[PDB]
Amino acid sequence: RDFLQLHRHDSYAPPRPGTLARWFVNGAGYFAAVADAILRAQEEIFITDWWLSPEVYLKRPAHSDDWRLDIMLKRKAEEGVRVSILLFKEVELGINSGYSKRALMLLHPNIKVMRHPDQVTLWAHHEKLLVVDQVVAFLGGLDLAYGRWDDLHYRLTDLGDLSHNQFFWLGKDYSNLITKDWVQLDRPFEDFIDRETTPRMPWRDVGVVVHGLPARDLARHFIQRWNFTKTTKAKYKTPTYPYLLPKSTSTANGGQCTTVQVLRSVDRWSAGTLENSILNAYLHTIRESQHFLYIENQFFISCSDGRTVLNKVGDEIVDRILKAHKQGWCYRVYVLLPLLPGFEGDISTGGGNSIQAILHFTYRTLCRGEYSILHRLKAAMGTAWRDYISICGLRTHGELGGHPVSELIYIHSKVLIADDRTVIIGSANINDRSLLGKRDSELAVLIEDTETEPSLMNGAEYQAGRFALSLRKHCFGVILGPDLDLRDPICDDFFQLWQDMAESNANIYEQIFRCLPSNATRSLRTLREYVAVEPLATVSPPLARSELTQVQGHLVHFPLKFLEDESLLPPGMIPLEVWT
Numbered sequence: 001r002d003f004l005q006l007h008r009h010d011s012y013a014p015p016r017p018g019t020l021a022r023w024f025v026n027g028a029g030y031f032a033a034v035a036d037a038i039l040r041a042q043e044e045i046f047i048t049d050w051w052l053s054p055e056v057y058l059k060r061p062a063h064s065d066d067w068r069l070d071i072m073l074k075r076k077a078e079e080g081v082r083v084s085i086l087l088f089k090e091v092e093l094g095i096n097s098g099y100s101k102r103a104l105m106l107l108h109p110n111i112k113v114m115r116h117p118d119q120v121t122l123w124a125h126h127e128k129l130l131v132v133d134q135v136v137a138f139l140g141g142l143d144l145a146y147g148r149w150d151d152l153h154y155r156l157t158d159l160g161d162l163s164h165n166q167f168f169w170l171g172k173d174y175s176n177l178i179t180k181d182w183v184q185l186d187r188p189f190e191d192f193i194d195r196e197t198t199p200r201m202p203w204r205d206v207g208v209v210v211h212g213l214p215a216r217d218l219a220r221h222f223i224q225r226w227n228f229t230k231t232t233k234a235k236y237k238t239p240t241y242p243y244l245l246p247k248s249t250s251t252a253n254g255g256q257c258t259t260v261q262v263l264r265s266v267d268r269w270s271a272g273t274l275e276n277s278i279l280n281a282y283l284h285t286i287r288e289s290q291h292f293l294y295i296e297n298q299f300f301i302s303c304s305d306g307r308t309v310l311n312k313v314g315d316e317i318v319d320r321i322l323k324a325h326k327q328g329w330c331y332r333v334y335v336l337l338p339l340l341p342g343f344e345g346d347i348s349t350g351g352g353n354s355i356q357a358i359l360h361f362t363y364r365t366l367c368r369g370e371y372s373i374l375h376r377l378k379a380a381m382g383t384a385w386r387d388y389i390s391i392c393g394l395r396t397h398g399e400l401g402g403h404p405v406s407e408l409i410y411i412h413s414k415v416l417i418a419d420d421r422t423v424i425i426g427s428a429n430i431n432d433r434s435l436l437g438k439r440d441s442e443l444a445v446l447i448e449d450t451e452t453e454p455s456l457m458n459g460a461e462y463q464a465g466r467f468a469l470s471l472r473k474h475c476f477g478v479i480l481g482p483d484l485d486l487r488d489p490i491c492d493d494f495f496q497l498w499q500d501m502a503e504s505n506a507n508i509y510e511q512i513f514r515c516l517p518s519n520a521t522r523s524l525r526t527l528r529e530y531v532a533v534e535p536l537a538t539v540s541p542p543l544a545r546s547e548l549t550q551v552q553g554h555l556v557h558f559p560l561k562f563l564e565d566e567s568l569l570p571p572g573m574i575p576l577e578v579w580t
């Protein structure tokens with residue numbers, strides 16, 4: 001299909017039936033599959049990254065220079081493969097795109113990198129995509145950068161000439177972004193925190209690969225952004241940066257048979273056109289959802305008021321729940337977020353300007369204010385909102401220094417699942433920045449199933465989508481920890497079992513680690529005293545390990561009353577459009 005008309009959900013790309021698509025949870029399998037795709041490139045490699053760390057390894061542990069990203073791209077580039085890279089140009093943030101760009105272009109003359117934007121702006125290029133030969137395309141929330149690689153283990157420690165090393169995260173890759181963000185990126189293989197003292201912050205993300213027609217659709221988005229970026233500065237207008245051109249479309253002859261539609265967010269500054277098709281697909285999929293929603297997003301800033309926050313994703317969830325409550329349907333909404341926003345800050349003393357600013361708009365979407373989701377549900381159903389919505393986070397524990405350590409599993413995913421039939425994997429967070437189209441540039445794909453599996457829906461027979469059901473059962477089985485029945489996702493037996501574990505796990509982590517955030521600190525004056533108490537994990541480690549045997553999975557309830565007596569807004573100069 002062509003690109004003269006806008007398509008479903010006002011998307012530049014039409015739905016591509018018969019697409020072979022495969023999902024990836026955590027950066028382990030994603031970076032490994034990316035390495036396999038890079039290795040078999042014959043003509044072109046298209047890369048967009050909000051942050052690209054060149055020395056990252058796509059496979060672990062690192063024994064050699066093989067599987068290192070900048071080495072692999074250098075090995076394809078001089079077989080004749082044209083590597084075109086678009087990197088977000090920061091406002092020196094500390095991602096240091098200048099070092100990434102100069103290092104990438106130093107590898108081979110067949111590797112060309114353009115940085116955008118050059119002008120001062122609050123918005124960014126956020127989409128993560130790698131396309132090989134316009135036939136294989138990777139996208140999601142995973143940037144080829146430090147701290148993203150992780151697996152089901154969610155290791156908190158990395159203790160054990162690359163010949164005999166056994167570290168999974170080398171140097172700048174061993175990180176805990178809340179404790180301290182990156183510095184000195186021109187020294188990749190050196191540490192910037194203490195592995196013996198400070199644990200890792202696990203990284204949960206969801207990626208996806210598509211084959212065939214959607215990949216050319218995604219390659220056309222890159223080609224549009226590329227040739228448009230060629231027009232943005234005099235250095236890029238030279239023939240040094242070649243015009244990229246699409247590979248005409250019916251030259252299109254382990255993942256599943258799907259229907260995939262490519263959606264994106266673009267504006268005049270990011271590309272030559274406007275599109276908010278991710279937002280459209282988000283509103284529509286919520287509205288047509290018949291049974292449940294599984295949301296796993298880094299941010300959750302929604303609920304329109306016309307002035308501060310404009311996207312109506314949260315307003316679509318309240319309307320969908322309020323209707324299921326009036327008809328008497330069985331309808332669940334699972335929302336999983338990182339317990340803390342992703343910024344450096346001392347949570348022992350309140351978190352900081354940036355974290356509290358995000359928390360303000362997080363809780364405003366959830367529980368605090370007239371526009372919040374829960375306050376509007378309680379206005380129509382009272383305390384029965386606990387039956388329709390469940391907002392949780394993740395947290396795991398390990399050992400370090402001879403005593404148990406704990407840390408939240410930073411949920412960087414940007415995924416939505418509806419009715420075990422429809423999936424949305426992309427870079428778009430639930431906020432105005434990623435969704436409105438006018439701000440950050442984003443990508444997403446809508447994966448609707450065609451082949452179905454026998455399943456259960458509230459105790460009833462239900463042919464569920466093969467691609468979507470398998471993704472949710474992977475998410476549920478990991479956050480819930482062998483004897484569990486995960487077929488039915490909306491029944492009272494599972495939903496009660498779900499909430500019981502989210503609260504019990506939340507309790508145990510609070511008794512043993514006294515972790516933050518927590519419902520036990522509703523003010524800053526109370527928080528000052530809560531942190532002056534040493535937790536049981538370090539007082540009596542044998543006792544702590546005893547109680548930790550009762551934790552099942554990583555699911556912990558999201559603390560709604562955490563610092564609920566505080567402003568959470570900064571006194572400050574920064575436009576509030578930055579956090580919305």
Ligand SMILES: C[C@@H](CN1CCC(n2c(=O)[nH]c3ccccc32)CC1)NC(=O)c1ccc(F)cc1
Nearest residue numbers: 051093094095124126177181182183342343429
């Ligand atoms: C852990 C991670 C969290 N961080 C959260 C905000 C996010 N984020 C969006 O989603 N949209 C954004 C738009 C603009 C800027 C940030 C945006 C990025 C991930 N920190 C880094 O990756 C990092 C890298 C280098 C550093 F120096 C410090 C931190």
